[PDB]
């Protein structure tokens, strides 16, 4: 889905996401955002599902913003093989999520609509989500 087109490396290491979040700790564009209270790894397919749910429940009246993008590519060695023989092959692209940072944001639509849209998009994520208002 949402994937980078080229990279100087093909198989990088993993990353820890312990500790408090870094960057995107506050809303930027949208009026109401969805913060994550647990760090984890999310692929772009769940992001696509959340986006299509948001768009369908939104209508062509408000706007939405995505705050992260997959910049990393893990590997998954094919099934029923022995250990070793170098690293496997990549088959997905993942964006690291640190706890205490926002994932999706919406604006320009009544309160009930945006609240239900974010709640619908939240269950599609493997993290414990929480609603949040713009800091003003």
């Amino acid at each position: 889905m949402l994937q980078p087109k080229r990279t100087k490396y093909r198989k990088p290491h993993n990353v820890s996401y312990e500790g408090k979040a870094k960057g995107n700790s506050y809303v930027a564009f949208g009026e109401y955002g969805l913060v994550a209270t647990k760090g984890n790894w999310i692929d772009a397919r769940a992001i696509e599902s959340a986006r299509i749910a948001i768009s369908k429940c939104l209508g062509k009246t408000g706007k939405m913003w995505i705050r992260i993008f997959p910049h990393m590519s893990k590997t998954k060695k094919p099934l029923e093989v022995r250990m070793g023989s170098g690293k496997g092959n990549p088959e997905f692209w993942v964006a690291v999520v640190k706890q205490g940072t926002v994932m999706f944001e919406v604006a320009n639509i009544p309160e009930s609509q945006m609240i239900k849209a974010l709640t619908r998009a939240g269950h599609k994520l493997p993290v414990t989500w929480k609603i949040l208002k713009r800091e003003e």
Binding site: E80, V81, R82, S85, G86
Partner: peptide, 10 residues
Amino acid sequence: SKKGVGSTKN
């Protein structure tokens, strides 16, 4: 099972 999984190359 057994399979000639190799190709380290470096």
